[PDB]
Design a protein around this ligand. Structure first.
Ligand code: 1CA
Length: 230
């Protein structure tokens, strides 16, 4: 059953409208995308039944994984992965990557987009993997309904199996582990531009200000335990 509902609840499109200007713009796009993210999550099978608290945590702990992974999907569906399709009005060229002073991070997300096309990823696999990323980062000590959380997660994993079936399941779950590596780098650059936003002149909406404000204190503390498949 999950296969369908997941596919029916997929979001639409969001617009974005020197490093400082670009970065600030991306943080704007991010804040708007986030409501899109929350709408998609609220009606997610299994997930929606967890206490409200657990849903917030899971989201804030994965907002970057979800933003990054989704960008790749978009860069793959709209440009054959030859560009970074952040939004219809903001597609990154080799140049803007440099222009953004976030080049290698950009190359990082781009390389994910390259796997998608190389692997010929399908929307079904994407949907399930997206859910998995939403359930891959949890507090070091757990959540209020841990057992419920674990059962649900292992089920989405089995769901991805039935989906792919075995090199496929490996290639797909290894890419998700990879996502963890890229997301740690992004978050460091984020915590930096955030911490020194006034010195760099980098802006943050308010949704992001409240997500990042809880995030780094506990992430730089080692409390955000990433879940790996391999
Ligand atoms: C958080 C960030 C700006 C916003 C983006 C993020 C990378 C992933 C991403 C993809 C999107 O489609 C929406 C914007 C966004 C969420 C960047 C990594 C570092 C950068 C900064 O730290 C600039 O302040």
């Amino acid at each position: 059953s999950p296969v369908m509902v997941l596919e029916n609840i997929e979001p639409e499109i969001v617009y974005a409208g020197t490093a400082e200007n670009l970065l600030s713009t991306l943080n704007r796009l991010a804040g708007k995308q986030m409501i899109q993210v929350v709408k998609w999550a609220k009606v997610l099978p299994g997930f929606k039944n967890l206490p409200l608290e657990d849903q917030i945590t899971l989201i804030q702990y994965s907002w970057m994984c979800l933003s990054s992974f989704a960008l790749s999907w978009r860069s793959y569906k709209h440009t054959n992965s030859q560009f970074l399709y952040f939004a219809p009005d903001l597609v990154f060229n080799e140049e803007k990557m440099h222009q953004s002073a976030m080049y290698e991070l950009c190359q990082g997300m781009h390389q994910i987009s390259l796997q998608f096309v190389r692997l010929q990823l399908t929307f079904e696999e994407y949907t399930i993997m997206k859910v998995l990323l939403l359930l891959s980062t949890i507090p070091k000590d757990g959540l209020k309904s841990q057992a419920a959380f674990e059962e649900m997660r292992t089920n989405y994993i089995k769901e991805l199996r039935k989906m792919v079936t075995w090199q496929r399941f490996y290639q797909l779950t290894k890419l998700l582990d990879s996502m963890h590596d890229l997301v740690s780098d992004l978050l460091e650059f984020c915590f930096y531009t955030f911490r020194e936003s006034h010195a760099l002149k980098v802006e943050f909406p308010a949704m992001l200000v409240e997500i990042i404000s809880d995030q780094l204190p506990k992430v730089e503390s080692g409390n955000a335990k990433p879940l790996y498949f391999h």
